[PDB]
Design a protein around this ligand. Structure first.
Ligand SMILES: [Zn+2]
Length: 257
C-alpha cells in the first residue's frame, strides 16, 4: 500500500522496504560544482531504431509504455556501461505544479517532470533476475520543463484518456522513443536504485544534462490521470516523485567538461 499520499508516501516506505535507508538510494541532487568530468566515460549509444512498443499501462503509480524486450531491438550501450542493456519500459514522474515533479535535481533545481527509460543487462537473461544485481539496470533519465510542445510526446498524451485509472491498459504499438530525446547526450552518471518500491540498488543512472520541453497542455493531461481504480474515489495522479536521497559514499561523474 505504498504511494505518494500523506500516509503512505516516501517518508513511510522504509517500514516495508528497509533499503529505503540504504547506501545507494535514488534519486539524488546533482551538484554541478562537485561532479567531476571523467575522460574515461564514452559517448552513450542509444539504438532505438528497431524498438517495438506494445502497450501502455496505468499501474496506479505512473503509466508505463512497454516494449518487446525478447530480442536486442532497443538497446543502450556505451557511456559508463559494460555490455548491452535492453529497453523494457519508460515512464514519467511529475508534479501538481510546474515548479516540482522531477526526482533528480540539479543544484537543487526541480524540473516539472522526469522521464525514465528503463533497461536491463542482457547478461542476466530477464528483468527479474537483473534487478537482483548491482549492475542489472541502466536508467536513462531526462528532465522535462514546460515551454514549447514536444511533438514526439503527443501520441502518449492522446492515449491517456483510455488509461485514466489504475489497472487500465491500451494497445500502444509503433511508438518511437527517439522522439523523447533532447539534442545532446551529455550526461551525469552514478550508482543508485529504483525510485519506487522495492527500491533495489541495481541501477546505473545516466541523467541527461539537456532537458526536453513539453507544453503546458501536455503536462496538464498527465495531471488528469488517476491513482485510483475505476469506481473508486478520484485522486489525481500528481506528485508521484521521490525526493532526493543522501549521496553517501558516491561520486557523480560527468561525461562533459
Ligand atoms: Zn521512475
Amino acid at each position: 500500500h505504498w504511494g505518494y499520499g500523506k500516509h503512505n508516501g516516501p517518508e513511510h516506505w522504509h517500514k516495508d522496504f528497509p533499503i529505503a535507508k540504504g547506501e545507494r538510494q535514488s534519486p539524488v541532487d546533482i551538484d554541478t560544482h562537485t561532479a567531476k568530468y571523467d575522460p574515461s566515460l564514452k559517448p552513450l549509444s542509444v539504438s532505438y531504431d528497431q524498438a517495438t512498443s506494445l502497450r501502455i499501462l496505468n499501474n496506479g503509480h505512473a503509466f508505463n509504455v512497454e516494449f518487446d524486450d525478447s530480442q536486442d531491438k532497443a538497446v543502450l550501450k556505451g557511456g559508463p556501461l559494460d555490455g548491452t542493456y535492453r529497453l523494457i519500459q519508460f515512464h514519467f514522474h511529475w508534479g501538481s505544479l510546474d515548479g516540482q515533479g522531477s526526482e533528480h535535481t540539479v543544484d537543487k533545481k526541480k524540473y516539472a517532470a522526469e522521464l525514465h527509460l528503463v533497461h536491463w543487462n542482457t547478461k542476466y537473461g530477464d528483468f527479474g533476475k537483473a534487478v537482483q544485481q548491482p549492475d542489472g539496470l541502466a536508467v536513462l533519465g531526462i528532465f522535462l520543463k514546460v515551454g514549447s510542445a514536444k511533438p514526439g510526446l503527443q501520441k502518449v498524451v492522446d492515449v491517456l484518456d483510455s488509461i485514466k485509472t489504475k489497472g487500465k491498459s491500451a494497445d500502444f504499438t509503433n511508438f518511437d522513443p527517439r522522439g523523447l530525446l533532447p539534442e545532446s547526450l551529455d550526461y551525469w552518471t552514478y550508482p543508485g536504485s529504483l525510485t519506487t518500491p522495492p527500491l533495489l540498488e541495481c541501477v546505473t543512472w545516466i541523467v541527461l544534462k539537456e532537458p526536453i520541453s513539453v507544453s503546458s497542455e501536455q503536462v496538464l493531461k498527465f495531471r488528469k490521470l488517476n491513482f485510483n481504480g475505476e469506481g473508486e474515489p478520484e485522486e489525481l495522479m500528481v506528485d508521484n516523485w521521490r525526493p532526493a536521497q543522501p549521496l553517501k559514499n558516491r561520486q557523480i561523474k560527468a561525461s562533459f567538461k
